[PDB]
Design an enzyme around this catalytic site. Sequence first.
Site, PDB file in Angstrom:
ATOM      1  N   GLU A  35       1.018  -1.345   0.112  1.00  0.00           N
ATOM      2  CA  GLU A  35      -0.099  -0.066   0.126  1.00  0.00           C
ATOM      3  C   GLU A  35       0.776   1.377  -0.063  1.00  0.00           C
ATOM      4  O   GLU A  35       0.521   2.222  -0.742  1.00  0.00           O
ATOM      5  CB  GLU A  35      -0.789  -0.054   1.321  1.00  0.00           C
ATOM      6  CG  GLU A  35      -1.975  -1.004   1.192  1.00  0.00           C
ATOM      7  CD  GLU A  35      -3.178  -0.908   0.364  1.00  0.00           C
ATOM      8  OE1 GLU A  35      -3.040   0.322  -0.298  1.00  0.00           O
ATOM      9  OE2 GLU A  35      -4.009  -1.803  -0.169  1.00  0.00           O
ATOM     10  N   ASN A  46      -7.959   8.552  -5.709  1.00  0.00           N
ATOM     11  CA  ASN A  46      -8.619   7.566  -6.380  1.00  0.00           C
ATOM     12  C   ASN A  46      -9.470   8.479  -7.547  1.00  0.00           C
ATOM     13  O   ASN A  46      -9.686   9.684  -7.260  1.00  0.00           O
ATOM     14  CB  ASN A  46      -9.600   6.988  -5.212  1.00  0.00           C
ATOM     15  CG  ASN A  46      -8.847   6.029  -4.069  1.00  0.00           C
ATOM     16  OD1 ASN A  46      -7.954   5.666  -4.631  1.00  0.00           O
ATOM     17  ND2 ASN A  46      -9.141   6.490  -2.956  1.00  0.00           N
ATOM     18  N   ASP A  48     -12.444   8.487  -8.015  1.00  0.00           N
ATOM     19  CA  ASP A  48     -13.673   9.171  -7.285  1.00  0.00           C
ATOM     20  C   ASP A  48     -13.550  10.448  -6.593  1.00  0.00           C
ATOM     21  O   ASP A  48     -14.536  11.121  -6.193  1.00  0.00           O
ATOM     22  CB  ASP A  48     -14.788   7.908  -6.701  1.00  0.00           C
ATOM     23  CG  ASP A  48     -13.949   7.644  -5.159  1.00  0.00           C
ATOM     24  OD1 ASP A  48     -12.667   8.370  -4.858  1.00  0.00           O
ATOM     25  OD2 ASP A  48     -14.698   7.245  -4.336  1.00  0.00           O
ATOM     26  N   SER A  50     -11.661  10.917  -3.820  1.00  0.00           N
ATOM     27  CA  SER A  50     -11.098  10.554  -2.637  1.00  0.00           C
ATOM     28  C   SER A  50      -9.574  10.244  -2.757  1.00  0.00           C
ATOM     29  O   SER A  50      -9.120  10.260  -3.657  1.00  0.00           O
ATOM     30  CB  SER A  50     -11.647   9.309  -2.080  1.00  0.00           C
ATOM     31  OG  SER A  50     -11.608   7.949  -2.629  1.00  0.00           O
ATOM     32  N   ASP A  52      -6.234   8.302  -0.624  1.00  0.00           N
ATOM     33  CA  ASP A  52      -5.591   7.410   0.222  1.00  0.00           C
ATOM     34  C   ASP A  52      -4.700   7.940   1.238  1.00  0.00           C
ATOM     35  O   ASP A  52      -3.594   8.696   0.505  1.00  0.00           O
ATOM     36  CB  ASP A  52      -5.160   5.938  -0.299  1.00  0.00           C
ATOM     37  CG  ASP A  52      -6.246   5.547  -1.405  1.00  0.00           C
ATOM     38  OD1 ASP A  52      -7.537   5.299  -1.005  1.00  0.00           O
ATOM     39  OD2 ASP A  52      -5.746   5.206  -2.265  1.00  0.00           O
ATOM     40  N   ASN A  59      -8.798   5.350   3.022  1.00  0.00           N
ATOM     41  CA  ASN A  59      -9.424   6.185   2.343  1.00  0.00           C
ATOM     42  C   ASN A  59     -10.313   7.316   2.658  1.00  0.00           C
ATOM     43  O   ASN A  59     -11.246   6.908   3.861  1.00  0.00           O
ATOM     44  CB  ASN A  59     -10.166   5.365   1.368  1.00  0.00           C
ATOM     45  CG  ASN A  59     -10.899   5.798  -0.073  1.00  0.00           C
ATOM     46  OD1 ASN A  59     -11.953   6.230  -0.018  1.00  0.00           O
ATOM     47  ND2 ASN A  59     -10.101   6.302  -0.936  1.00  0.00           N
TER      48      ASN A  59
HETATM   49  C1  LIG Z   1      -2.611   2.174  -2.884  1.00  0.00           C
HETATM   50  C2  LIG Z   1      -3.650   2.958  -2.813  1.00  0.00           C
HETATM   51  N1  LIG Z   1      -4.566   2.874  -3.404  1.00  0.00           N
HETATM   52  C3  LIG Z   1      -4.773   2.106  -4.546  1.00  0.00           C
HETATM   53  C4  LIG Z   1      -3.550   1.165  -4.349  1.00  0.00           C
HETATM   54  C5  LIG Z   1      -2.750   1.066  -3.631  1.00  0.00           C
HETATM   55  C6  LIG Z   1      -3.670  -0.104  -5.314  1.00  0.00           C
HETATM   56  C7  LIG Z   1      -4.436   0.151  -6.396  1.00  0.00           C
HETATM   57  C8  LIG Z   1      -5.874   0.754  -6.548  1.00  0.00           C
HETATM   58  C9  LIG Z   1      -6.764   0.902  -7.554  1.00  0.00           C
HETATM   59  C10 LIG Z   1      -7.883   1.802  -7.529  1.00  0.00           C
HETATM   60  C11 LIG Z   1      -7.801   2.792  -6.635  1.00  0.00           C
HETATM   61  N2  LIG Z   1      -6.836   2.793  -5.553  1.00  0.00           N
HETATM   62  C12 LIG Z   1      -6.017   2.116  -5.611  1.00  0.00           C
HETATM   63  V   LIG Z   2      -6.528   4.082  -3.847  1.00  0.00           V
END
Ligand SMILES: c1cnc2c(c1)ccc1cccnc12
Ligand SMILES: [V+3]
Length: 129
Positions: A35, A46, A48, A50, A52, A59
Amino acid sequence: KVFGRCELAAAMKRHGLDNYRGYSLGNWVCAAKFESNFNTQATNRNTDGSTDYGILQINSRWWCNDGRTPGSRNLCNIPCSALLSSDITASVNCAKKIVSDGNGMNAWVAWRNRCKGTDVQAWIRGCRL
Ligand SMILES: c1cnc2c(c1)ccc1cccnc12
Ligand SMILES: [V+3]
Ligand SMILES: [Cl-]
Ligand SMILES: [Cl-]
Ligand SMILES: [Cl-]
Ligand SMILES: [Cl-]
Ligand SMILES: [Cl-]
Ligand SMILES: [Cl-]
Ligand code: NA
Ligand SMILES: [V+3]
Ligand SMILES: [V+3]
Ligand SMILES: [V+3]
């Protein structure tokens, strides 16, 4: 902060993740590796809108507030920036809520695709725990 592998394992263990909801420690280390590469400052957007955040790429759509994810929740009741701290407490406490939600660790895409069904214990091999 970029944690070393065993340093992160220890921190995760102290915070109660080893075997939390039945997920051995190696699962959590493996998830963090894929990650965030063990970097607490990691962020990724992302499609959408959002974002992470942190070591476990939690998220904003559901779990934290970043003020820029309309219609989202803040189930961990924290600013997303708290998940980027060198101290992993907030990330671990939030992860505990996530993994208890129904789908377990499948909530982490990298875990399902890179850790699930593999020899996750390798991620803690050699560590003094
Ligand atoms: C870390 C954070 N977000 C992601 C990933 C790894 C891996 C795949 C993924 C696919 C769609 C959206 N976010 C992620
Ligand atoms: V992601
Ligand atoms: Cl393990
Ligand atoms: Cl990504
Ligand atoms: Cl805000
Ligand atoms: Cl928001
Ligand atoms: Cl820590
Ligand atoms: Cl489960
Ligand atoms: Na949010
Ligand atoms: V739910
Ligand atoms: V084994
Ligand atoms: V090897």
